[PDB]
From Swiss-Prot, chain A:
Taxonomic lineage of the native organism: Archaea, Methanobacteriati, Methanobacteriota, Stenosarchaea group, Methanomicrobia
Superkingdom of origin: Archaea
Cellular location(s): Cell membrane
pH dependence per the UniProt record: Optimum pH is 5.2 for ATP hydrolysis.
Gene, per the UniProt record: atpB
Protein name (Swiss-Prot/TrEMBL): A-type ATP synthase subunit B
Native source species: Methanosarcina mazei (strain ATCC BAA-159 / DSM 3647 / Goe1 / Go1 / JCM 11833 / OCM 88) (Methanosarcina frisia)
Family the entry assigns: Belongs to the ATPase alpha/beta chains family.
């Protein structure tokens, strides 16, 4: 029933106790205690205890720290000294502007920047499944993401839920050794930590991102891995009917912030369970309103990292993040043409398995070969290969040369003459 | 080793047996047997350069319409075997029917969350993405009974192919097609769970060959509904050379990586441009990836998808389609003046944006409480309820024309302040808004 609000444990409470919760403006909401850890009370909202909301200790000094799901140090450092104590439920400060997401976030991964571009303020889930490398892709984006040319500084907030010890040490090591830590706040919730902390983890993370974005004028990228495990924690506390509204209190929290010098961008990982007997398939579609990045078993089976299939992927806001002054003027054309040539080449793989390879026409054979060049040169890149959008677009142009120039129906002749390697002038 | 073909069994055969096959075009192929049922052999052919067989054929005639057949094209309806005009091979090699033209123009399914916001166009492949326990079967059957091509000079037909189904489901589909009269414009292929696996593998090939024959030889727009590609894949991963082999590992046969493309290649406008083959495949998320790895179904998703949402199912709403993750990539080629109506794109864009905003505000309401939400936000919050209750919700038997759909859209859009309709041109507000 009713939505979840998190409260600091200041006095003992009982199950089903009726309580008041003090909101950031001095008003109070009433609810009932649902559960609690030793330090955090979970309240369902509709003489008596009046509770304070659970707070994040907020400071620019959160950057470079690795913390638990409850905000406590996990890196052997001192507790955070706060500038502000901010309600993590999201209710003390409305940082979001009524503005659409826009302008480019360069992940350095061609199958996102090139064909499915992430924009500032967007929520763009990675949609994956058991046994696929969504975790490596999330960490690669956390190492590589930037906002080319932005006057606002950039930060990452990386929140991992229900993870093993082994995973935790791997994530800490990767952030530390690459320097990615120095612009990040990292929240790690272990599988064995109290379960209440698992559901507080993304609220801590989004609070930190809102504080950096709005009070320090930053574009902040929040990567949340992964929401299925968060759904699991609600279930443990089919999925509960209130889960769909609860998820909305996570996916409402994204966008450009007031003043438009900062933004909160989310990339949640939505992984489908590999055995629905023990882990039922949750409906996480509420999070998918601005497109998705699809991690595909076919590509992984073929030994290609990252195994992202651009055809089912989409970024509904891409056009607000690309072109002259953002990426390059020819970006939309090249994206459209690669998409169309790869879709045609893939259908032609079907055709070769109907009529045989030697029956395909010479033109069809160019498109068949293009689908292989696309997967081998454009989709495939190294774990630590950080490609600028220029790099991405020039790979695109090189593999597009395999097609007959007269078959480039998605590219304006003005871009063919300016950028196609057969016509472009050396400057 | 190349393509898989399907052959009339006339004697027992062994695995990997070399066979000569007379093809539908009169030429001969040599190939190796992979598997068989009582009456069908699956053969992988060799390029160019013992048992001699003929290919399994569809008995193609316009008199397939009105008939209920098995996966192999045998009658299920107590009628006589089809009398063929032509006997066509079924693997996709027959006819060479497809044009190099883009899909376009409207198919009216009568369901608003398809036509209104994610429009199906002639020649498109638009999958329904769903999961166990959701009503994807009912949606597939509703579109089969309701679909048409408004204003087209070409005749319309449905090919409905159901794979791996129970006897009770088969009984229900027969009754439904018969009782509503949808049968007279349909060919129905029913494959049962306990029919041979190889018959399940042939089932979508029979169906697509019938659709290509009616589209290309008879100038029809044909809508092929395939339910469920997941159950097709669960048969495929146990057939022939795939048995107990693991995707991505040595021993897994190359043809497994291209089989589903032999189904999804088979759609489009046909030569002559008087007809077309449109597919609505059902892709149910299987739930058992660990124990039954199948070919990746994502290859089927290139022109959008219709997403069936358990949230909406649990709220009591049918059809429980969530338009926000749903997409039709070819929608703009099927809408607007002379296809649907000139305000269609604007109304869809505005519904989509208000619904997405309202759904975000269900999160903000939970964060701050209803009493704290602004008057403007409350109107959008309410709009997402009106969208779900009035536009998404429609009856199983309710066939809305596109005009019925746009009119419901306008009505619910009057709940928003007119100055908040930023995706609708003023020309359209004055012409079509209920207050003007
Ligand atoms: N808001 C209630 C209106 C309504 C309308 C139809 C149904 S149903 O039984 O067909 F699912 C349920 C509720
Ligand atoms: Cl902790
Ligand atoms: Cl669910
Ligand atoms: Cl695969």
């Amino acid at each position: 029933a009713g939505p979840l609000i998190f409260v600091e444990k200041t006095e003992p409470v009982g199950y089903n106790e009726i309580v008041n919760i003090k909101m950031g403006d001095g008003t109070v909401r009433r609810g009932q205690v649902l559960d609690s850890s030793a330090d955090i009370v979970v309240v369902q909202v509709f003489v008596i205890f009046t509770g304070e909301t659970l707070k994040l200790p907020a400071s620019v000094d959160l950057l470079g720290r690795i913390l638990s799901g409850s905000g406590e140090p996990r890196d052997g450092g001192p507790r955070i000294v706060p500038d502000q104590l901010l309600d993590i439920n999201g209710a003390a400060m409305n940082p979001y502007a009524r503005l659409p997401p826009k302008d480019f976030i360069q992940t350095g991964i061609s199958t996102i920047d090139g064909t499915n571009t992430l924009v500032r303020g967007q929520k763009l889930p990675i949609f994956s499944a058991s046994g696929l490398p969504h975790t490596e892709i999330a960490l690669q984006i956390a190492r590589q993401a930037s906002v080319p040319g932005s006057e606002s500084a950039f930060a990452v907030v990386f929140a991992a839920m229900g993870i093993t010890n082994e995973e935790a040490q791997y994530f800490m090591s990767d952030f530390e050794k690459t320097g990615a830590l120095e612009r990040a706040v990292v929240f790690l919730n272990l599988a064995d930590d109290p379960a209440v902390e698992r559901i507080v983890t993304p609220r801590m993370a989004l609070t930190a991102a809102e504080y950096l974005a709005y009070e320090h004028g930053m574009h902040v990228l929040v990567i949340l891995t992964d929401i299925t495990n968060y759904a699991e924690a609600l279930r443990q506390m089919g999925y509960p009917g209130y889960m769909y509204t609860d998820l909305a209190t996570l996916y409402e929290r994204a966008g450009i912030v007031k003043g438009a010098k900062g933004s909160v961008t989310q990339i949640p990982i939505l992984s489908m369970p590999g055995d629905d007997i023990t882990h039922p398939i949750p409906d996480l579609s509420g999070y998918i309103t601005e497109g998705q990045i699809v991690v595909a078993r076919e590509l992984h089976r073929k030994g290609i990292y990252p195994p992202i299939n651009v055809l089912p992927s989409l970024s509904r806001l891409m056009n607000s993040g690309i072109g002259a002054g953002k990426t390059r003027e020819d970006h939309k054309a090249v994206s459209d043409q690669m998409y169309a040539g790869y879709a045609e080449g893939r259908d032609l793989r079907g055709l070769v398995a109907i009529v045989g390879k030697e029956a395909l026409s010479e033109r069809d054979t160019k498109f068949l070969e293009f689908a292989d060049l696309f997967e081998d040169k454009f989709v495939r890149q190294g774990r630590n290969e950080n490609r600028t959008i220029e790099d991405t677009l020039e790979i695109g142009w090189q593999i597009l040369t395999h097609l007959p120039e007269n078959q480039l129906g998605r590219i304006d002749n003005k871009y063919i003459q300016k950028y196609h390697p057969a016509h472009r002038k050396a400057k």
